[PDB]
Amino acid sequence: KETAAAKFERQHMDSSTSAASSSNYCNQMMKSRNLTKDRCKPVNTFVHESLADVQAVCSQKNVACKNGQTNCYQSYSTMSITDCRETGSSKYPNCAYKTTQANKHIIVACEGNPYVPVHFDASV
Ligand SMILES: [Cl-]
Ligand SMILES: [Cl-]
Ligand SMILES: [Cl-]
Ligand code: NA
Protein backbone atom coordinates (compact mmCIF):
# COMPACT_ATOMS: atom_id res chain seq x y z
CA LYS A 1 0.00 0.00 0.00
CA GLU A 2 1.92 2.98 -1.35
CA THR A 3 2.18 6.30 0.47
CA ALA A 4 1.36 9.41 -1.51
CA ALA A 5 4.93 10.65 -1.44
CA ALA A 6 6.25 7.30 -2.63
CA LYS A 7 3.72 7.17 -5.46
CA PHE A 8 4.91 10.59 -6.59
CA GLU A 9 8.52 9.38 -6.60
CA ARG A 10 7.69 6.27 -8.57
CA GLN A 11 5.51 8.05 -11.14
CA HIS A 12 7.53 11.19 -11.66
CA MET A 13 11.19 11.00 -10.62
CA ASP A 14 13.93 10.02 -13.06
CA SER A 15 17.18 11.48 -11.76
CA SER A 16 19.29 8.84 -13.52
CA THR A 17 19.21 10.67 -16.85
CA SER A 18 19.55 14.36 -17.65
CA ALA A 19 16.99 14.24 -20.48
CA ALA A 20 15.11 11.85 -22.74
CA SER A 21 17.42 11.17 -25.68
CA SER A 22 15.17 8.76 -27.61
CA SER A 23 11.65 8.41 -28.96
CA ASN A 24 11.26 5.18 -26.95
CA TYR A 25 12.02 6.70 -23.51
CA CYS A 26 8.36 6.90 -22.51
CA ASN A 27 7.48 3.41 -23.68
CA GLN A 28 10.33 2.01 -21.58
CA MET A 29 9.79 4.14 -18.48
CA MET A 30 6.01 3.84 -18.33
CA LYS A 31 6.46 0.08 -18.31
CA SER A 32 9.34 -0.08 -15.85
CA ARG A 33 7.59 2.14 -13.27
CA ASN A 34 4.54 -0.11 -13.57
CA LEU A 35 2.31 2.55 -15.07
CA THR A 36 1.00 0.23 -17.77
CA LYS A 37 -0.27 -2.59 -15.52
CA ASP A 38 -3.99 -3.15 -16.05
CA ARG A 39 -4.31 0.08 -18.00
CA CYS A 40 -2.28 2.51 -20.04
CA LYS A 41 -1.90 5.64 -17.91
CA PRO A 42 -2.80 8.29 -20.47
CA VAL A 43 -0.41 11.11 -19.44
CA ASN A 44 2.62 11.22 -17.15
CA THR A 45 5.55 13.55 -16.63
CA PHE A 46 9.03 12.53 -15.53
CA VAL A 47 11.39 15.06 -13.91
CA HIS A 48 15.15 14.76 -14.47
CA GLU A 49 16.41 16.56 -11.43
CA SER A 50 17.56 15.36 -8.05
CA LEU A 51 14.89 14.36 -5.57
CA ALA A 52 16.16 17.07 -3.25
CA ASP A 53 15.69 19.75 -5.88
CA VAL A 54 12.12 18.59 -6.55
CA GLN A 55 11.27 18.41 -2.82
CA ALA A 56 12.58 21.97 -2.47
CA VAL A 57 9.85 23.21 -4.75
CA CYS A 58 7.48 22.84 -1.78
CA SER A 59 9.21 25.94 -0.32
CA GLN A 60 9.06 28.01 -3.55
CA LYS A 61 6.22 29.94 -5.19
CA ASN A 62 2.79 29.15 -3.74
CA VAL A 63 0.13 29.07 -6.49
CA ALA A 64 -3.29 27.59 -7.06
CA CYS A 65 -3.62 24.08 -8.35
CA LYS A 66 -5.87 23.47 -11.35
CA ASN A 67 -8.51 22.05 -9.01
CA GLY A 68 -8.64 25.20 -6.88
CA GLN A 69 -6.60 23.94 -3.94
CA THR A 70 -3.88 26.25 -2.61
CA ASN A 71 -1.12 23.76 -1.71
CA CYS A 72 0.60 23.95 -5.09
CA TYR A 73 4.05 25.36 -5.70
CA GLN A 74 5.77 26.48 -8.88
CA SER A 75 9.50 25.99 -9.21
CA TYR A 76 11.47 29.20 -9.48
CA SER A 77 13.72 27.71 -12.14
CA THR A 78 13.02 25.55 -15.13
CA MET A 79 13.73 21.83 -14.83
CA SER A 80 14.39 19.05 -17.31
CA ILE A 81 11.16 17.12 -17.86
CA THR A 82 9.76 14.55 -20.21
CA ASP A 83 6.05 14.46 -21.01
CA CYS A 84 4.68 11.00 -21.91
CA ARG A 85 1.30 10.86 -23.64
CA GLU A 86 -0.52 7.95 -25.18
CA THR A 87 -0.73 8.13 -28.98
CA GLY A 88 -3.91 7.60 -30.94
CA SER A 89 -2.83 4.08 -31.81
CA SER A 90 -2.22 3.06 -28.17
CA LYS A 91 -4.46 0.29 -26.84
CA TYR A 92 -3.99 -1.75 -23.68
CA PRO A 93 -2.02 -4.02 -23.28
CA ASN A 94 0.19 -2.57 -26.04
CA CYS A 95 0.53 0.91 -24.66
CA ALA A 96 2.35 3.39 -26.92
CA TYR A 97 3.58 6.82 -25.88
CA LYS A 98 4.86 10.00 -27.46
CA THR A 99 7.98 11.38 -25.75
CA THR A 100 8.35 15.17 -25.48
CA GLN A 101 11.44 16.52 -23.73
CA ALA A 102 11.36 20.07 -22.48
CA ASN A 103 12.76 22.48 -19.92
CA LYS A 104 9.95 24.04 -17.97
CA HIS A 105 8.85 25.15 -14.56
CA ILE A 106 7.07 22.45 -12.62
CA ILE A 107 3.97 22.82 -10.43
CA VAL A 108 3.47 20.29 -7.66
CA ALA A 109 1.08 19.84 -4.76
CA CYS A 110 2.71 19.32 -1.40
CA GLU A 111 1.42 17.68 1.78
CA GLY A 112 2.54 16.12 5.00
CA ASN A 113 5.41 16.11 7.46
CA PRO A 114 7.93 16.26 5.93
CA TYR A 115 6.20 18.53 3.43
CA VAL A 116 6.91 16.88 0.10
CA PRO A 117 5.37 16.59 -3.34
CA VAL A 118 2.38 14.28 -3.69
CA HIS A 119 0.86 15.33 -7.01
CA PHE A 120 2.20 16.67 -10.31
CA ASP A 121 -0.14 19.43 -11.44
CA ALA A 122 1.39 20.96 -14.56
CA SER A 123 4.49 22.34 -16.15
CA VAL A 124 4.92 25.85 -17.51
CL1 LIG B 1 5.48 -0.60 -8.32
CL1 LIG C 1 1.74 13.97 -14.85
CL1 LIG D 1 4.14 35.34 -3.23
NA1 NA E 1 3.00 10.53 1.96
| Domains of the chain, residue spans | 1-124
44 is in an annotated binding site: yes
Residues around ion ligand 2, judged by CB within 5 A, are: 44-45, 120
Ligand nearest to the CA of 119: 2
Ligand nearest to the CA of 120: 2
10 is in an annotated binding site: yes
100 is in an annotated binding site: no
Q: How many CA atoms lie within 13 A of 68 on its CB side?
A: 0
Residue 84 amino acid letter: C
User: Cα-flanking dihedrals φ and ψ of residue 42, to 5°?
Assistant: -70, -35
Task: Identify which of 7, 28, 26 has the alpha carbon closest to the alpha carbon of residue 116.
Answer: 7
Gap from CA of 113 to ligand 2 centroid (Å):
23
Give the active site residues: 12, 119
- What approach was used to elucidate this structure? X-ray
Instruction: Please check whether residue 51 is in contact with residue 80, taking contact to mean a CB–CB distance below 8 angstroms.
Output: no
Instruction: Please check whether residue 12 is in contact with residue 46, taking contact to mean a CB–CB distance below 8 angstroms.
Output: yes
